């Protein structure tokens, strides 16, 4: 129902890294570059006029006055690249003297200047010390949304200024860093920052028969809001393991100790509005015991193709962690981890240090592989599960014993051009499949390929993992069931046709559709694209909203490079980009 268009003409975009790589043939000598142009049905006409300046062998700059018709002014993009004894870095400063759209959209602000400053740095003093800077600042909270800045990092809508100093040798690592946010009075998003954070690692092996590893961390959490709690956390984690290996099997026993100290302040607004009070000083101490084993069998597969070998690789793991109540510790950095077959053997449930769930479980898995006469693996299939002897309780959380989840994997290499992949997460105590994905692809070269897809996700899984308002919204609750197909074919020797079609079998409505053609010559390339895709909701009749886009692109190459037909660049232009999978 909504249509768009794009018309871009310019030189082939070449990149030269943010850090200078020493003067190479006097770079390119001072002078203007090939200007670009762009017309869109939304932002109208735009023009770029880059200019390259070679100040010194170690310093160069680029000035690109960008003219935007809708805003009715020119925004000056300045770029600085240097290389001193300390290291190499980049400086960027965009500046729009006055914005016309901003005045209408934001009447409260008195001035309509728009600017952004970005500074990067990197330097390895001697051969151990390392320094890094990542500085970003913007004039208004709506800068990142309005403009497509070439450089600049935004986290949760805030511009982040990050510094770090690191020391690294073969066995010892030390890193201290601080990160801050640029918060405006019109933003209410909550986010935590580490000002500062210290990480220390130390590995020492061959301590008799054992190995040893120490890990420690001290961090201070400060929120962008004045009512959220703050804390200072100190962590220590000594580990020691005894790895035993054989020709056919191996077993690894590891013992680890976890010690964490908390110091929480600003616990008034949260404490008043919640029944569970956060303690000022919390000390968490837990040991951990883990035993991992593996065996490998093999067989000469003679009834099928001769000279092939089939293997069987059972694997079992036992993990024990005591239960400690963690309701008095606020959750600063801890989220539940989604798992696959390889994740069944993970010893952590949450990503972070705030929540450490108890564990009394045994994991089991079987993997079978097939090798050809050249000892090259062609096929492998894996099955696993986790058996819980005791519910994994993290103190607060929200039958939980026995075999609850199963996972699988598959990868068949039919030929040098054919490939097949799989994956499933069967969930017991519901008798339904939680997630699954499959793919089969034929690919001769970079321009000839056909692919098929399937992605599934049950409504129960979405309700269980995703936030609570997902299970009530009509655009999230039904789950995922999507079938796709990608194709490409280089007709003649100067053309290339690609396409993709993705269908949602749950709603019987397509999700994506693409068709592109590119004519490649020895001096220029012309590309035409089309795409129909979902682009939001309606909230009135509760139906999705589609968007149609037509793209016209002209490239001026003039360099006699390889300059492929255009495939692998168009294939990654829709909202569901192609991936090799082979």
């Amino acid at each position: 129902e909504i249509w768009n268009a794009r018309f871009k003409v310019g030189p082939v975009p070449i990149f030269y890294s943010p850090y200078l790589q020493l003067p190479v043939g006097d770079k390119r000598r001072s002078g203007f570059l090939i200007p670009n142009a762009k017309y869109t049905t939304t932002n109208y006409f735009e023009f770029y006029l880059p200019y390259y300046w070679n100040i010194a062998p170690n310093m160069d700059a680029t000035i690109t006055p960008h003219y935007m018709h809708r805003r009715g002014n020119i925004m000056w993009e300045n770029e600085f690249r240097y290389l001193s004894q300390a290291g190499a870095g980049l400086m960027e400063l965009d500046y729009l003297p006055s914005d016309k759209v901003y005045e209408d959209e934001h009447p409260n602000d008195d001035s309509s200047r728009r600017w952004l400053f970005y500074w990067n740095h990197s330097g390895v003093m001697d051969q151990v010390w390392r320094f890094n800077v990542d500085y970003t600042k913007v004039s208004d909270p709506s800068y990142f949304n309005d403009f497509d800045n070439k450089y600049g990092s935004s986290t949760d809508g805030y511009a982040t200024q990050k510094f770090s100093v690191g020391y690294a040798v073969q066995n010892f690592n030390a890193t201290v860093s601080t990160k801050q946010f640029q918060v405006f009075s019109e933003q209410n998003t909550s986010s935590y920052s580490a000002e500062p954070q210290l990480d220390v690692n130390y590995y020492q092996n061959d301590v008799g028969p054992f190995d040893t590893r120490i890990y420690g961390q001290a961090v201070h959490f400060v929120n962008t809001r004045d009512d959220m709690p703050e804390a200072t956390r100190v962590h220590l984690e000594p580990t020691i393991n005894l790895p035993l290996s054989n020709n056919w099997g191996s077993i690894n026993t590891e013992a680890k100790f976890l010690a964490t100290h908390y110091q929480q302040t600003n616990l008034d607004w949260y404490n008043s509005r919640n029944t569970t009070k956060l303690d000022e000083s919390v000390n968490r101490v837990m040991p951990q015991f883990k035993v991992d084993g593996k065996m490998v069998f093999e067989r000469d597969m003679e009834m099928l193709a001769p000279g092939y070998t089939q293997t069987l690789e059972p694997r079992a793991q036992y993990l024990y962690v005591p239960y400690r109540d963690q309701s008095d510790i606020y959750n600063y950095d801890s989220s539940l981890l989604q798992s696959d077959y390889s994740g069944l053997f993970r010893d952590r449930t949450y990503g972070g240090l705030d929540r450490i769930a108890s564990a009394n479980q045994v994991t089991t898995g079987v993997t079978s592989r097939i090798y050809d006469d050249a000892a090259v693996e062609r096929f492998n299939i894996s099955v696993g599960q986790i058996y819980y002897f005791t519910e994994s309780r993290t103190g607060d959380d929200n039958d939980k014993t026995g075999s609850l989840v199963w996972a699988g994997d598959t990868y068949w290499r039919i030929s040098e051009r054919w490939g097949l992949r799989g994956g499933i997460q069967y969930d017991t105590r519901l008798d339904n499949v939680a997630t699954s994905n499959s793919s089969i692809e034929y690919r001769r070269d970079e321009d000839r390929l056909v692919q098929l897809n399937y992605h599934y996700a049950s409504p129960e899984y979405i309700q269980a993992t995703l936030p609570k308002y997902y299970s009530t919204a009509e655009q999230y609750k039904n789950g995922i069931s999507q079938v796709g197909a990608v194709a490409s074919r280089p007709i003649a020797d100067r053309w290339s046709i690609v396409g993709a079609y993705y269908y949602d079998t749950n709603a019987n409505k397509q999700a994506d559709s693409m068709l592109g053609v590119q004519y490649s010559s020895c001096c220029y390339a012309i590309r035409v694209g089309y795409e129909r895709k979902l682009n939001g909701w309606d909230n009135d009749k509760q139906h999705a909203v589609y968007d149609n886009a037509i793209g016209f692109n002209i490239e001026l190459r003039g360099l006699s490079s390889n300059y492929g037909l255009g495939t692998q660049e168009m294939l990654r232009s829709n909202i569901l980009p192609y991936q090799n999978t082979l």
């Binding site: 040798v169 935590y192 989220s335 994905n437 996700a457 655009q475 039904n478 909203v545």
Partner: protein, 151 residues
């Protein structure tokens, strides 16, 4: 039932002692490869050692790609597909080099989380991805020994 315990070894006896060389010896992939080789009985050696009679494992470029895999009913990203490729070359002293590569796949849902929680989750995912890539790289060593014999 012709099954038997694996008579052949994981890392061929020609590669029981080898040199590990990389562009960043203190990086994460190098650490993962060193850890994986140690559990298989391989005795690591210094890069500038005095022995010119051991194979050399030279780690190469690492590429990580993250892209959308499926969408919700409003076009919002549902799951991400994460692919890491690792290139390496094994130099057998006297003979020619033997390129190997590893490709790892990982799919997960886009769970809305705070910045720190998302960063920790991504770091854990990438670390596990490196571990699996090192495991894949180790399994290609027997194929190299077979190809060396053909030469």
């Amino acid at each position: 039932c012709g099954w038997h315990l694996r008579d052949t070894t994981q890392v061929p006896s020609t590669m029981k002692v080898m040199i590990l060389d990389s562009g960043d010896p203190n990086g994460p992939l190098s650490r993962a490869v060193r850890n994986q080789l140690r559990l298989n009985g391989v005795e690591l050696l210094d890069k500038e050692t005095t022995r010119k009679d051991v194979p050399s494992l030279r780690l190469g470029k690492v590429s990580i790609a993250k892209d959308t895999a499926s969408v919700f009913r409003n076009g919002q990203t549902a799951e991400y597909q994460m692919i890491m490729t690792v290139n390496a070359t094994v130099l057998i002293p006297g003979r020619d080099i033997y390129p190997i590569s590893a490709k790892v796949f990982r799919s997960f849902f886009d769970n809305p989380q705070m910045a720190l929680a998302k960063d920790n989750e991504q770091d854990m995912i990438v670390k596990e991805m490196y571990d699996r890539a090192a495991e894949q790289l180790i399994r290609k060593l027997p194929s190299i020994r077979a190809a060396d014999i053909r030469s």
